[PDB]
Design a binder for this molecule. Sequence first.
Ligand SMILES: [Br-]
Ligand SMILES: [Br-]
Lengths: 250, 300
Amino acid sequence: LRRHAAPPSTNFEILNEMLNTRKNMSISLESSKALADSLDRCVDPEDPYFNTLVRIMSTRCMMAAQYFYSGAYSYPDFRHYGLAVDIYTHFTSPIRRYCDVVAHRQLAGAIGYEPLSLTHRDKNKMDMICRNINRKHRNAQFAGRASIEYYVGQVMRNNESTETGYVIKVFNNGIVVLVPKFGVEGLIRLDNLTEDPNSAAFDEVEYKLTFVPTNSDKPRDVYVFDKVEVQVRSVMDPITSKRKAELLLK
Amino acid sequence: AKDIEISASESKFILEALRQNYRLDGRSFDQFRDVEITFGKEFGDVSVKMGNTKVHCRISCQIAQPYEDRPFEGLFVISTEISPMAGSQFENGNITGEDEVLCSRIIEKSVRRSGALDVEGLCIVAGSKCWAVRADVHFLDCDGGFIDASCIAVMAGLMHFKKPDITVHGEQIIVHPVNEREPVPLGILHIPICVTFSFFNPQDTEENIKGETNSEISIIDATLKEELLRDGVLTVTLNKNREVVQVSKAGGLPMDALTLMKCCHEAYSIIEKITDQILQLLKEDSEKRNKYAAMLTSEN
Ligand SMILES: [Br-]
Ligand SMILES: [Br-]
């Protein structure tokens, strides 16, 4: 089977903190439907992409779904939060998922087509299969996302363009902006963020970072969830040899 | 002990009837008796009936501490003490007799050893507190087939039984009564079913040892009269997964290997029908208890 644990309150307390402070909103977390409804109404009229940004950000604070065998947990633990179903598994893709192969053999024995192999009726062997495909699943998505990272990083290799960015993380050492066009997150250090780093201030209560831009002299307050203009640029670090995307806001 | 006297006439008649494809109850050589399963009010209370054979099983459990060797496993025992109620042939408490120890060992190897019950799921807190499931078989009336009747009685009971729900606060065990929250069923890895074959030599020993053509007769699920006149016994246990749980032909009349294999395949068709039968009677019992629960709440 395959279950999905309900997200802890601690994961959304930080998101609701930024929402209630800046946008004056909140996510219920009372139920999956409550979480969905509150996430749905979380939309800014001046910018349609704001709702998408919150969704792609509230996805990062969800518990990882995992494969398992029905003897390892009780029935209420079979619950899949993200789908709101009492029970679930993978079956539709046996060519690209070994989990579906197991499910196929079990269904064949379920209908009486052919007796189920002993290896799929051993609680010990099933535990090894589940712990393996869980690890291979994580390694698959990470390798997949890394493949996107390299090719996109090669597109912006020798190119600079003013794209649309969104502030997702605010710190005293700088900010982190997300470019939806390339799907790449970038870090703008305080030294390259503004002039006179000793004059800049960070308010944790409001998630606001006030500073004076390098090409200006007017105190600008940069809050969170703000749509800002950002110049993209790629440079391979001479120490890590990883193609990172250096971003300069405007 | 107290013996059952069998005349030469009765011995010759029942054996000759077998030579003419006749058995007294009118069954067939490969025909298993109709198994009737009745559940009591409480969970774990099951009554199995095969013709005149009557057995009753009761599943119970209590909080106990696991063995030092197995801190993650719960306790599980099966009791099958005979009594003069099933007949004066049985001595009260005779748990060392040949047939008694065999029967006790067949059930144990079919349920306990086979791991039909998930003993790992009987653990509440590792190496401290666990459930101790007990299966008590009561032999009410004997007309043969006590092994097959017991194996069905134990399994039907275990699948029907439900233990009180438990929430754990460290080592503090909160045992919820049936009044507060509903009880929790047991974990069954597989459903073992026993089928016993009885062998008869229509000729003499010489033709069994050195005889060219085999002629030994084998019948399924013998009655008491057929059981007292057999020359060999075979108990084979299988499940719907097409696997042999255990086979026990402890001596007796030497039998052809291919014939014993035929019995195993014949038994598989029986255990399939029996297993599905048990499951259906469990569903209807669940539907009955739920329908009454709805009629009790509506009237409340
Ligand atoms: Br253990
Ligand atoms: Br009879």
